[PDB]
Design a protein around this ligand. Structure first.
Ligand code: CL
Ligand code: CL
Ligand code: CL
Ligand code: MG
Ligand code: MG
Ligand code: RB
Ligand code: RB
Ligand code: RB
Ligand code: RB
Ligand code: RB
Length: 135
RNA sequence: ACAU
DNA sequence: CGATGT
């Protein structure tokens, strides 16, 4: 209903899907960029959205922050809830990097705890998430 | 259909 | 137009 401005927002950016994947996290209130992942040569939009949330979890945990995370990705929110990224992307030599990061993110979720609420950014009511790439 |  | 997902 109301934006929780005291929060972290994350988003993926890509060149192609599958294609070059990156992601970032911003302070919802100000747009300040808090983290950015170096581009990964081949991945999917949803793998990037998933990695972005998990990185946000790890970022806030390290800083003892109880802020929620906003994502616009129905898929990635569910994957994080399940601790399982159900991606269709073929596992081969050229997707090995994205799949390593996805596998490592699942592994982190399965060995750590957090109470961070992971919230759906309501794009239809609020406009584009503040972490959007503008592509 | 909804979310990207 | 195409692709990723529930
Ligand atoms: Cl990552
Ligand atoms: Cl909350
Ligand atoms: Cl959701
Ligand atoms: Mg997004
Ligand atoms: Mg976006
Ligand atoms: Rb901590
Ligand atoms: Rb967008
Ligand atoms: Rb965009
Ligand atoms: Rb969106
Ligand atoms: Rb579809």
């Amino acid at each position: 209903e109301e934006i929780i401005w005291e929060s972290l927002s994350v988003d993926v950016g890509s060149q192609g899907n599958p294609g070059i994947v990156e992601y970032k996290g911003v302070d919802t209130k100000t747009g300040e960029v808090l983290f950015e992942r170096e581009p990964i040569p081949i991945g999917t939009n949803n793998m990037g959205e998933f990695l972005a949330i998990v990185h946000g979890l790890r970022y806030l945990k390290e800083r003892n922050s109880r802020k929620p995370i906003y994502s616009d990705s129905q898929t990635a929110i569910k994957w994080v809830k399940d601790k399982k990224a159900k991606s269709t992307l073929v596992r081969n030599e050229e997707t090995a990097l994205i799949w390593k990061l996805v596998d490592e993110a699942e592994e982190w979720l399965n060995t750590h705890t957090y109470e961070t609420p992971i919230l759906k950014w309501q794009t239809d009511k609020w406009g584009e998430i503040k972490a959007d790439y503008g592509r």
